[PDB]
Amino acid sequence: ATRIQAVYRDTGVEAYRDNPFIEALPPLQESVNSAASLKSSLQLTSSDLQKSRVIRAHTICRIPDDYFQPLGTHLLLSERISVMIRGGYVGRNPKTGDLQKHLQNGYERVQTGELETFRFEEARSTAQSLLLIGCSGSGKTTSLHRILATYPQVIYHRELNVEQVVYLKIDCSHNGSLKEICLNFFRALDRALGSNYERRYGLKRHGIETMLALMSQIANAHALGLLVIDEIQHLSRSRSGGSQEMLNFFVTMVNIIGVPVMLIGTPKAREIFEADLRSARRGAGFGAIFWDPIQQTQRGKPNQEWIAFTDNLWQLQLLQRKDALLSDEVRDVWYELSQGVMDIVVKLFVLAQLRALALGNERITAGLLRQVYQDELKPVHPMLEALRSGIPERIARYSDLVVPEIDKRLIQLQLDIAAIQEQTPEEKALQELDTEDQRHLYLMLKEDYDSSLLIPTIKKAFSQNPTMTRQKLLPLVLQWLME
Amino acid sequence: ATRIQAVYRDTGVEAYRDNPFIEALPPLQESVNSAASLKSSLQLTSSDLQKSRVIRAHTICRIPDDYFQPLGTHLLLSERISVMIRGGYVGRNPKTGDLQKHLQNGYERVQTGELETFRFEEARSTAQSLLLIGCSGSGKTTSLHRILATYPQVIYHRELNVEQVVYLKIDCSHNGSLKEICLNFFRALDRALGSNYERRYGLKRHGIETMLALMSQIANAHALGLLVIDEIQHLSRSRSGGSQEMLNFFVTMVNIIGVPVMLIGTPKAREIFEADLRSARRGAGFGAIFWDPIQQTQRGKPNQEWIAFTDNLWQLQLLQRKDALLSDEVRDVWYELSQGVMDIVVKLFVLAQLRALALGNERITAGLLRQVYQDELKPVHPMLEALRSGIPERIARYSDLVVPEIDKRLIQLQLDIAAIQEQTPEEKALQELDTEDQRHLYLMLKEDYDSSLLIPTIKKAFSQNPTMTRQKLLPLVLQWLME
Amino acid sequence: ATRIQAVYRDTGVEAYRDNPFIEALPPLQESVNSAASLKSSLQLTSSDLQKSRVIRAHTICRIPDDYFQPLGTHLLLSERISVMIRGGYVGRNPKTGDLQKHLQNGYERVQTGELETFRFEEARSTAQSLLLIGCSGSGKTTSLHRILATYPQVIYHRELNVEQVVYLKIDCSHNGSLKEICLNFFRALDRALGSNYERRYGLKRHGIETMLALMSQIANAHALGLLVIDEIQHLSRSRSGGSQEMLNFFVTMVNIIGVPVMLIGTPKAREIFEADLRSARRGAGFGAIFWDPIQQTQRGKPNQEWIAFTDNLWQLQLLQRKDALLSDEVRDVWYELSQGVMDIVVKLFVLAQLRALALGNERITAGLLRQVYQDELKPVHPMLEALRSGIPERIARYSDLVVPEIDKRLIQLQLDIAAIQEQTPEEKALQELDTEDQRHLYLMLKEDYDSSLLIPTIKKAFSQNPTMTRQKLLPLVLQWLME
Amino acid sequence: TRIQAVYRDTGVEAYRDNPFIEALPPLQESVNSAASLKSSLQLTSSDLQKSRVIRAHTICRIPDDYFQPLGTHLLLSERISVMIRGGYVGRNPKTGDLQKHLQNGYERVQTGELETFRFEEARSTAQSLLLIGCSGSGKTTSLHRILATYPQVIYHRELNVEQVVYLKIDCSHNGSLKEICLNFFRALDRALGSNYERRYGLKRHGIETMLALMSQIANAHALGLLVIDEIQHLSRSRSGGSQEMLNFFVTMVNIIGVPVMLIGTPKAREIFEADLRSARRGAGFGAIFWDPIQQTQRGKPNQEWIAFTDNLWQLQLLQRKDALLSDEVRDVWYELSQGVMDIVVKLFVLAQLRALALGNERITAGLLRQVYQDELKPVHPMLEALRSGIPERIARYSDLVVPEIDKRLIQLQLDIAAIQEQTPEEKALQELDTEDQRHLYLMLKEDYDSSLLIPTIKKAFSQNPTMTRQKLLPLVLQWLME
Ligand SMILES: Nc1ncnc2c1ncn2[C@@H]1O[C@H](COP(=O)(O)OP(=O)(O)O)[C@@H](O)[C@H]1O
Ligand SMILES: Nc1ncnc2c1ncn2[C@@H]1O[C@H](COP(=O)(O)OP(=O)(O)O)[C@@H](O)[C@H]1O
Ligand SMILES: Nc1ncnc2c1ncn2[C@@H]1O[C@H](COP(=O)(O)OP(=O)(O)O)[C@@H](O)[C@H]1O
Ligand SMILES: Nc1ncnc2c1ncn2[C@@H]1O[C@H](COP(=O)(O)OP(=O)(O)O)[C@@H](O)[C@H]1O
Ligand SMILES: [Mg+2]
Ligand SMILES: [Mg+2]
Ligand SMILES: [Mg+2]
Ligand SMILES: [Mg+2]
């Protein structure tokens, strides 16, 4: 964001009494009511129903990028992230103007023997950590770019010159080499503040240890609040080095830097972080958070969350004919097919809608859902089979599965509907004619007479009189044409 | 591109309310079917092919330069242009204060208590920089130079003192460097405005980083709508820093200016952006639409696009003894020799027609098309056969291949056609005929009967009316000759 | 941040005619009476002698910051500021055109018969730059902040859409660098106008030359009159660079911006510009106005400015036992203890009364001046010894010291002067009298006649005739006193 | 000055198809060549009745904006025009496809048809002009205004050449020969927009490497001239002597074209007065010597001196302005100044600047003598050297210049402005002679309106000669009553 100037509020918690950093943040919110703040959806009216199908295709393909329904887990995630972001500023207070005289007076008093004991310097260290482990397509990056986004970004302080970089989010590289996770940090920080940390610290040839030590020198001047490392699966066990080297790099990174680093990954990456007790102890600073796909029934009774989700997204459909009441057969087959993962349901919506408005029909049917499932979900069937089987031993084997290049498929469907339109009514007059002899006659007789009687008279002459040659058609055609 | 005084009206959507520069744009409601209104096609007359081979040659020569068939994909591109020009400027409203003022006011509201939770979402609306990628010769330049032509370049405002440059078309010159793109951006802006800036800006003391800021100042000053950086394929990657640094230049350029920008390139130039767009990030920007050649069959059915295009080009040829219909074998050879790209299609059709006129046999078939392809279209053979091969790696190898100086070859062959002096029977038919009016009688009554028994009987029996209509003269020829 | 609408007033000078930036400025014709309109002083009443000691001390505390004496140097500085500001605008006339069009037209004419001769010079007016050099404490800042406050800061034109920023001021800080001045430019511009230039064009990654170009074009987008840089001494000689690099940067800054730029410097800062000041060329500019301390000995006669200043300041005293007429010795001694630096003139005068209010008798004597000099003038002892020595090198090298933290000393003196329990005969004589006005007769008559029987006589007279003023009573009060 | 090129033909046969010469201002005859240099101040009649500070400010700008072209500026303008327009004929881009012509000549010369041919490669040397004259005679203000008729830069559309018509270089107060090659780049990247200083003028390069780098740049841009000014300011011990400073301006024959110009004092011509080498190359196009104006060249006084004196007289800003110049004042100028340009205008400016301070408001010969003896003290020996007429003394004292007279003008302006404070009511204090009167007034001013304090105290001291301070007060109050 931009340099939002600080406006101070007094948090009721005693431990945050004097910090400008904690008091410049948005106020504490109730965790029960904080879930409703994330909700967002598109706006629909009755006027847009009767519109060209290209604009409708655009406004229904924008659904997955602008629809977000808060779930049960969002409240816990928001609470944990708030505690992490506001609990790492206690030992990093800036206002210590009266420290020298206090410490010197205590030193004199304990030196003369008047005082029994005194504590000169204590500042607290070690950085908390948390991991958010879940399967791909479960909304770990859609729901964490909103909970983390209700906060501001870089905040300037008028009295000091420190700018409080509230958060920073980096993604791991495909090759996963550790020299690029320590190098994406500089670019992600440059794109926020607007500096040249890359040229000064990255292009220069420093070792991994030196480049890791320089990170804590620019993560201390600008009071970083959080550092989230995403797509840890790509870095996990790629061409980066040994597993011991990876684990020790993460341990040393958590130790050196003073900010609450968070890790996100697929359950395949759980095994490396449970390698030794040191890494498990450091990573599980606030326990662990695991994300489970939605079940159709909570405990025997049907899931209220499932009904609410596939009603609040059901009512977002844009079709000529749409029934408000959703049948239970569609719901049952939908839980059978999509298995509850959040990424596949919205893709099923958009794909089925595009195919329906391209094939002419204006209703979505369970048969259409099955057809789309067999048509354009081929790469994800191993993952969905693992989910539906209920055997978790090899779920992590296929948990990395993503639909490849689905966006280009969406663009191809949009191109197909745009190029197919609804019909070609201007060429229906030519479509009435079925013989090439009649086509020839119309072609030569196009300029002679108006097109109003070119089709009907020729068609009647060719139909009422069954067979003849091409040459003898024209005199009878003109004889009919005069009257 | 002249000076039009701004006139205001009401928009279809309230989201663009009261913005002066958006309102001054041409209205959106009247363009119900812009594809039909953009269909430019030269129409031949009944008797323009009158003993004048020069006129026919000029008419055929004008076809590659003055033929435009709008497909259904151009409707999608027009919709994207409209969305990008009308939805990416809502932030820069001169009536309101600024985005920063709104963000700070919302922060004050949420800190005080009036507003519950402000969403610091870095409000930028769409602001997506489309990446238009297609094979060379597909018609991208000729499509964006005509769809972006119903918009006046400079709409004027009298209330303020700002000139609105609605669109600016930048063409990257051959063997270009990374500085001359900014230089000719300035040149095009001066040409479209009339105020020089290169004298005080285009000085070699400044570096490329300074030119970017000087560009950003002018861009924010005039509130320009779109920027199109065309022909990235023609630049030189040797003089510049390289592919890795030009990507940095591009991302800095799109990020700093803040206006929507579109890039036009070849699949070979995709290699520059492969490192960025292939990364899984919906927030990374650089959205793309792929220009694919139209195919004969998709899912086993013949596409009507090829049929319509071939028919439309078929009715616009001038040949004395042409065949009215296009054979299935002829279309099969067309697809086997062109494979979908359109630039080779029009040049091949024109060259085949003129060669058939020149060599004395006028009927385009597999043999004549094969001869003209083996005689003139040999330099373009590699890529045409490569697209039939269909290997994606092979296409980008020779994607840049364009036939050299084909306009010079066109003028040379036009000069060469004048070398013929032999007389064809239609010359005798049109020379032994006296008057201007009766000339089309031979043209439209040649198929049924031969001229030797045609002309005497009809010239004797035309004496029913001294001023007979050429339109009304059909029946006598057929009815009085079979007797 | 003043926001005044412009109104156009005609100017009598021929060269100034028809220019809409110079007519909105305050009229030149009023300069005759505006030359000496800056006089200001505190007002003292005879009733302020009988008021309480602490509030008298508070009144004396405000002597330095509300007393101003116009000298001969302020006249010259005001004339030069007026000329520079109003003559740097003649070139930039937005109603007829710029320089380049005129030069091109003149060259076109001289290439033909018309306009036999032309002068290819520039109406640059030397781009006036003033290097105001003087010893610290001479009173430069608090005169440039009083002769530049008469002009409205932001004159806004409504026919056009530009804000005529008549003057903009840049200040310096401790241990400054070259880039800090450039950022302070945008800081001051945002403080004045209220725009947001700093956040979107004051990024940390920009170099000096890019920042210089950005400054040059932004200061021309808004009509700017003057760029004043104050306290160039505080720039650091180590972190920014050597003497040559600062000189080169300042020369580049003056040359590229275009508007007149004024510089405020100390004799040590003159060492930076020794090279260009020695170059006897006035085309570039860098004319120097030399501040000097107030020198009594002028052409073998005390400077009438010194006598006027010292008498005006001496009438501003509040003492119960004050001496009426200044003696030659008492003024002379604090002349050699003042050295003409006027900063340590008003400081000594305001400290003398505050110390004498507690040291004993209430009279400004030479001894208390001497003890103040030996006690609280320690930092500027070598300042003044260099000044009395008269060696140019010693006075040049020994400058910049400013007697830090006078405020704490003054307030401590007020707290200490509060706690005096003893009442002098002057103060205890008050309680015997009753009305506050009637002590005026006592003050007029205490020194010349014995007061012990005088004050009963005052009671007698006022009690005998209550309802008459002091002036009516005075002759009869005297005749009762003596006769 | 990036002026685009417009070509006009010229009457000379040698400038037929030359872009560089035809893109220049047209040839101007001898008559109107001097009228374009003239400049004078306006000084309308409304300026006479003004404030003294603004009038002194206007007076302190007469030398800056007053130029009277004499009879010796026309010759210099003509020679500069010939020098600029004659050094381009060998550098013109008017060359067709010479390869075919040269090959044809080569094939024809060896078969006996043509006896001889000419395969030309290089032509012409650098013309040098040695303009030397006494310091203070005006060799720079009479050169800037002559060069100000030509545009500095010209841009050609068909080609890609920026014809930098001239370039002026200044020498430092104590500089070697290595500080003349840095000034070239530092002035060329200012005349144009470039960065030659940080690219070519490094520290590693020697004198010869930079002197050879200058030629490539002076031929990339068709540099029409190069003026080196104040050779006198070079130090003869930091450079090498009079044989490494004489050889350095002779080795500037290797610079292609660019007809250089050298300006110096008759004591800096001792560098070139060691041989004919720079008496031939340096005097390759003449050697013009400035001569101060002589009052009587013939029996009749010359027109130059009287015209200059009159046209300087008409710019007086004085309330009591003398209508006509008198003969005695003119003779005083000629005796005191001896014809030096920098001294006549300086005497006039300082005289009418002191007239304001002393309040006389008239220019007198005694005032001229006073200001000459007061201010122009260091440049006396030059004046007696000129008066005696011995060339040795004149050459010995030809670097004498007034040191830092701008500062002296600043204190003069300050002194004029310091007088301006005059207040009528303080004439009471002037009337307030007796200290007892001051004591009485300071006490009694607040009691009664200050209007009648003056007459009351004046009457009190007039009627009674002496009395104690105490008894004066009842009588003063009695007078205030009546
Ligand atoms: N609660 C939700 N409601 C609606 N859509 C969701 C929800 N959670 C996730 N999605 C959708 O899932 C899609 C992909 O999420 P993604 O970023 O791939 O998560 P992850 O990276 O953890 O797999 C997003 O486009 C988003 O629209
Ligand atoms: N809609 C269209 N109808 C017919 N021909 C077209 C159409 N669009 C493009 N073309 C053909 O494409 C050719 C120009 O292609 P061009 O725009 O240069 O491709 P690129 O932008 O890849 O270089 C023209 O000769 C034209 O005949
Ligand atoms: N002409 C003046 N009239 C009245 N006070 C002055 C004058 N010049 C200086 N002063 C006093 O000197 C004090 C310090 O001046 P300062 O701003 O430090 O000057 P500088 O910045 O040139 O050192 C101010 O408090 C001011 O009251
Ligand atoms: N022909 C002239 N007419 C009027 N003033 C002149 C003339 N020549 C010189 N001056 C005055 O002499 C002053 C200094 O001359 P300058 O050329 O600097 O001396 P030098 O030739 O020694 O460098 C200039 O300010 C100018 O006003
Ligand atoms: Mg993810
Ligand atoms: Mg193109
Ligand atoms: Mg100051
Ligand atoms: Mg000189």
Curated annotation (Swiss-Prot), chain D:
Molecular-function GO terms, alphabetical: ATP binding; ATP hydrolysis activity; DNA binding
Signal peptide range in chain numbering: none
SUPFAM superfamilies linked to this entry: P-loop containing nucleoside triphosphate hydrolases
SMART domains: AAA (SM00382)
InterPro entries named among the record's database cross-references: AAA+_ATPase, AAA_22, P-loop_NTPase, Tn7_TnsC
DNA-binding region: 385-404
One Pfam family matching this protein: Tn7_TnsC_Int
Keyword field: ATP-binding, DNA recombination, DNA-binding, Nucleotide-binding, Plasmid, Transposable element, Transposition
UniProt-annotated binding residues for ATP: 133-140
Entries under CDD domains matching the protein: AAA (cd00009)
Biological process terms in GO annotation: DNA recombination; transposition
Gene3D superfamilies assigned: 6.10.20.30, P-loop containing nucleotide triphosphate hydrolases
Domain of life: Bacteria
Record text on subunit structure and interactions: Monomer. Interacts (via C-terminus) with TnsA; this interaction allows TnsA to bind donor DNA.
Biological role stated in the UniProt entry: TnsC binds non-specifically to DNA in the presence of ATP. It is required for Tn7 transposition.
Protein name listed in UniProt: Transposon Tn7 transposition protein TnsC
Organism: Escherichia coli
Primary gene name: tnsC
